[PDB]
Amino acid sequence: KKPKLLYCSNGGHFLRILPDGTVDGTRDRSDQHIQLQLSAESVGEVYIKSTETGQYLAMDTDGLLYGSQTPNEECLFLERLEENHYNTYISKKHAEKNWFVGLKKNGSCKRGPRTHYGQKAILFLPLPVS
Numbered sequence: 001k002k003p004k005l006l007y008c009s010n011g012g013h014f015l016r017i018l019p020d021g022t023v024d025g026t027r028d029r030s031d032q033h034i035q036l037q038l039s040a041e042s043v044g045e046v047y048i049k050s051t052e053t054g055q056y057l058a059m060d061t062d063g064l065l066y067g068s069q070t071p072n073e074e075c076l077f078l079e080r081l082e083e084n085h086y087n088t089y090i091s092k093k094h095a096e097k098n099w100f101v102g103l104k105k106n107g108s109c110k111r112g113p114r115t116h117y118g119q120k121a122i123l124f125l126p127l128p129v130s
């Protein structure tokens with residue numbers, strides 16, 4: 001649990017949270033906002049924070065991901081390992097809606113209600129930073 005990169009296979013991107021709270025993905029290994037710290041706030045729960053800006057990955061009430069300055073309830077995710085050995089993170093708040101953290105092929109954040117268990121857009125591979 002050192003700063004990791006959240007690599008999404010659908011499109012091959014690095015999930016990232018911009019200074020202005022925008023969350024999306026990118027292919028530049030040199031991006032200053034792709035370094036995330038993953039705090040485990042319980043047995044299968046986690047917090048994902050932009051070390052570069054302090055912001056925490058959070059999903060609003062409509063499934064849109066954004067960067068929150070404080071770590072509220074909307075910032076927890078149930079980190080799960082899947083079949084092909086990837087990690088998928090589903091919003092704990094909306095767990096019942098099956099809303100995950102995901103990236104579209106073109107690297108733009110994939111809306112929570114547009115994601116679903118099984119989709120390749122929800123697969124992330126933590127890679128080592130620096």
Ligand SMILES: O=C(O)[C@@H]1O[C@@H](O[C@H]2[C@H](O)[C@@H](NS(=O)(=O)O)[C@@H](O[C@H]3[C@H](O)[C@@H](OS(=O)(=O)O)[C@H](O[C@H]4[C@H](O)[C@@H](NS(=O)(=O)O)[C@@H](O[C@H]5[C@H](O)[C@@H](OS(=O)(=O)O)[C@H](O[C@H]6[C@H](O)[C@@H](NS(=O)(=O)O)[C@@H](O)O[C@@H]6COS(=O)(=O)O)O[C@H]5C(=O)O)O[C@@H]4COS(=O)(=O)O)O[C@H]3C(=O)O)O[C@@H]2COS(=O)(=O)O)[C@H](OS(=O)(=O)O)[C@@H](O)[C@@H]1O
Binds near residue numbers: 118122
């Ligand atoms: O009716 C209207 O007027 C409109 O209503 C809504 O629009 C509808 C579409 O009209 C409708 N078309 S359909 O006629 O019903 O088919 C439908 O489009 C869906 C279709 O699934 C599909 O359509 S199409 O290809 O025929 O055009 C297409 O799929 C997109 C994905 O959405 C996109 N996801 S991404 O994550 O953003 O990139 C992307 O998928 C990639 C990914 O790599 C991966 O997807 S995902 O699992 O991560 O989601 C997946 O990978 C597959 C791989 O392709 C596959 N290869 S093989 O060919 O099977 O061998 C294999 O390797 O497996 C993997 C993994 O699979 S799995 O195990 O995870 O399942 O798929 C690929 C991929 O296909 O490329 O790209 C595809 C293709 O798109 S592209 O543009 O052709 O490149 O579009 C979606 C879509 O959501 O748009 O449904 C929409 C939405 O309807 S809804 O409203 O009911 O949701 C729409 O409504 S509105 O609400 O937006 O207003 C309005 O546009 C119109 O009003």
